[PDB]
From a paper:
Here we report the crystal structure of dihydroprecondylocarpine acetate synthase (DPAS), an ADH that catalyses the non‐canonical 1,4‐reduction of an α,β‐unsaturated iminium moiety. We report four crystal structures of apo‐ and substrate‐bound DPAS from two phylogenetically related species. These structures reveal, surprisingly, the loss of the catalytic zinc ion from the DPAS active site, indicating that zinc is not strictly required for reduction by ADHs. Despite the presence of NADP+ in DPAS crystallisation conditions, none of the solved structures had sufficient density to model the cofactor. Although electron density for the structural zinc ion was clearly observed in all TiDPAS2 structures (the CrDPAS structure lacked electron density for this region), surprisingly, the substrate pocket lacked electron density at the expected site of the catalytic zinc. The lack of the catalytic zinc in DPAS is substantiated by the observation that two of the conserved catalytic zinc coordinating residues are mutated (His74Met and Cys168Ser). Computational estimation found TiDPAS2 had a larger substrate cavity than other structures of ADHs involved in monoterpene indole alkaloid (MIA) biosynthesis.
pmcAlcohol dehydrogenases (ADHs EC 1.1.1.1) are NAD(P)H‐dependent medium‐chain oxidoreductases found in all kingdoms of life. These enzymes typically catalyse the reversible reduction of aldehydes or ketones to the corresponding alcohol. The structural motifs of ADHs are highly conserved in all known eukaryotic examples; most notably, a zinc ion involved in catalysis, a second zinc ion involved in maintaining protein structure, and the Rossmann peptide‐fold involved in cofactor binding. ADHs have been shown to catalyse many complex biochemical transformations in plant natural product biosynthesis, suggesting that their catalytic repertoire has been expanded.
Numbering used by the authors:
A (entry chain A): 5 to 362
B (entry chain B): 5 to 363
The structure:
């Protein structure tokens, strides 16, 4: 029994029947506080496109009942005897993964988001063999290595999507030098990840073009986010005039799309950084890749030290997501709106004020 | 008309009918020596898989009659008034491309192989609008920037495949730091490009595993080429035992193949360098790419300063291709053997002694 598997009671919303994807009230339990654990009372949980893909039953390996949500901002209500960096009552946030092997090269050099055995935010077994429950719940318990200190100046709700969308965009750009004035960057897709890529790029001084198939988004892209230009990808005239003009492109789309027009936008030796995860494979245009000497680079989240640095950057430059704050019992309707793209640009669930037991 | 479009006569072998891919004797002409040109009497021409892909009619943009061959070693018989780096009588070699726009960033910075308007070795228009004829011919004339000095100590026939296979392997490794001892390198495919990547890596001190679908190649890979290990690609125990063990993999195959097993062989942040050009599309497994923070990097030939440097390295370290020297009128059978992989590891055509004028 989920309410009997562990000693401390907990509750949230869960997809009980994977074939419908409907979340409903759900009681379970969480492990006791180990020596290095932090109990977190959850304030806000962001909703990302991976949550939606999970509720659409598109990830076979996940276990159900599924409690998704992996953009958690909360309060530490309890720390184990060996926690010293975080005091009870502090505002904290959780990384988009919950553990690593602790022994490989990535873990030992604090690049642990690339551990081959990274434990994702929910739906798979933790080190103690039990399935992980995510942020659509009242409280969570996390090993202190994966708990960040949340800056006092950052809106807890507006900053919650920095914990997976923001860090993915921030890290991709920091690791590949796309954070310096003089770089011309393309951002493909203007959803949660894309709109945060535009904000971080502006704060670095990067010149940014948004590349989109939705012309109604030109106005938000230029006026709201500060993009230097808007490229309608279906307009062959604009596409040909941008050939060879980008140093890098950050591709955030969750659907299958052609890669070669994107490679033709790159100058020689430019990088196409892939951070979205389409559920179907893409075609590798070999001659454009070879002849331009171009690179396809994958990137996922960021390591926990980079995430702390990202949060402190976001607090100093007032970088938050554009959010709609929702009650938990709206989550099923939000999923539909997220599926249609009717959100500008992030849902954030107010857990503390709107979740109650089943 | 091919014989009348330029002032100097020439001859070789050509695919006249693109739908059969059969080469036959062919008379044409080549331009006069301009001020910056070098006329080259062709001694040897290497045959690569791209020649075969061209003769299989898989590249729409080529024009016919098609004279392929782009691994040319020769003797300078004539230089334009403004040539000084090359003397008549010198052994020379030609890069696998013939010109560039001359004005873009890649051009002005001696990275000209990545010029967006690079003129390839044959089958497309030159700066004067005429179709280029490749190395399966008696002489060629090339702008001096794309002519290399060929080392005296290097075998002209064993060194001919350095001009496209060798340079592609050398540059890919020099450009991405796969030339430093301590790197564990995978070489996928043990054909012309693959076997020169192994030699170049052993000469750099790099630990090299050959990844192959042909177990019969294990003895040649370990004993003749010097590979440190041989990984049979179809053996799941072996593939699973190598997961996460490679720093980089150079993928040399000319056919479609699954990409995700190769990405699993890479450690996190590892590089998969693509130098073969399969004619059908490849599938990109994003989840492994994303999960590992891994890279797919394309690379093509090398610049001409790098090609010269590759040649002097190959002379000082005795790096040559393992070749079968063939007469030109065997080229159609060689194409068949090349299609089946029945060659260890390069055909080189002896142009000077076996090519004669048609009829
Ligand atoms: C940063 C979150 C993304 C999301 N998507 C898809 C995959 C995925 C991840 N978490 C999930 C949880 C449930 C279902 C799917 C996923 C994750 C988590 O981030 C890290 C460093 O683990 C991932 O597994 O990358 C290895 C990230 C990749 C892109
Ligand atoms: C070095 C040769 C390869 C070959 N294949 C395929 C494509 C191609 C090139 N030459 C040909 C000539 C005839 C038909 C196809 C090709 C080339 C060479 O161009 C250079 C050296 O700059 C290429 O990149 O052409 C833009 C190389 C890429 C892989
Ligand atoms: Zn690890
Ligand atoms: Zn150029």
């Amino acid at each position: 029994s989920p309410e009997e598997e562990h000693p401390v009671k907990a509750y949230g919303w869960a997809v009980k029947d994977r074939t419908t994807g409907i979340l409903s009230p759900f009681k379970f339990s969480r492990r006791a506080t180990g020596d290095n654990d932090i109990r977190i009372k959850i304030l806000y949980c962001g909703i990302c496109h991976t949550d939606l893909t999970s509720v659409k039953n598109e990830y076979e390996f996940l276990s159900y009942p599924l409690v998704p949500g992996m953009e958690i901002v909360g309060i530490a209500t309890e720390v184990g005897s060996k926690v010293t960096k975080i005091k009870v009552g502090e505002k904290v946030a959780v990384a988009a993964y919950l553990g690593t092997c602790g022994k490989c090269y990535n873990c030992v050099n604090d690049l642990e988001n690339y551990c081959p055995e990274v434990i994702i935010g929910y739906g798979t077994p933790y080190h103690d063999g039990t399935i992980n429950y995510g942020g659509l719940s009242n409280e969570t318990v996390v090993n202190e290595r994966f708990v960040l200190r949340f800056p006092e100046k950052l809106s807890p709700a507006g900053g919650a999507p920095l914990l997976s969308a923001g860090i993915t965009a921030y890290s991709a750009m920091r690791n590949h030098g796309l954070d310096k004035p003089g770089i011309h960057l393309g951002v493909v897709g203007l959803g949660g990840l894309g709109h945060l890529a535009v904000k971080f790029a502006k704060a670095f001084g990067v010149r940014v073009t948004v590349i989109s198939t939705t012309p109604s988004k030109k106005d938000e892209a230029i006026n709201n986010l500060g993009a230097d230009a808007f490229l309608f990808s279906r307009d062959d005239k604009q596409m040909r005039a941008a050939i060879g003009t980008f140093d890098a492109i950050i591709d955030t789309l969750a659907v299958v799309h052609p890669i070669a027009p994107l490679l033709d936008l790159l100058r020689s030796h430019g990088k196409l950084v892939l951070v979205g995860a389409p559920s179907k494979p893409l075609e590798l245009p070999t001659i454009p890749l070879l002849s331009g000497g171009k690179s396809l680079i994958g990137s996922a989240a960021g390591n926990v030290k980079q995430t702390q640095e990202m949060l402190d950057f976001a607090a100093e430059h007032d970088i938050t997501a554009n959010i709609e704050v929702i009650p938990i019992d709206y989550i099923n309707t939000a999923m539909e709106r997220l599926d249609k793209g009717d959100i500008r640009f992030r849902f954030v669930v107010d857990i503390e004020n709107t979740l109650t037991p089943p």
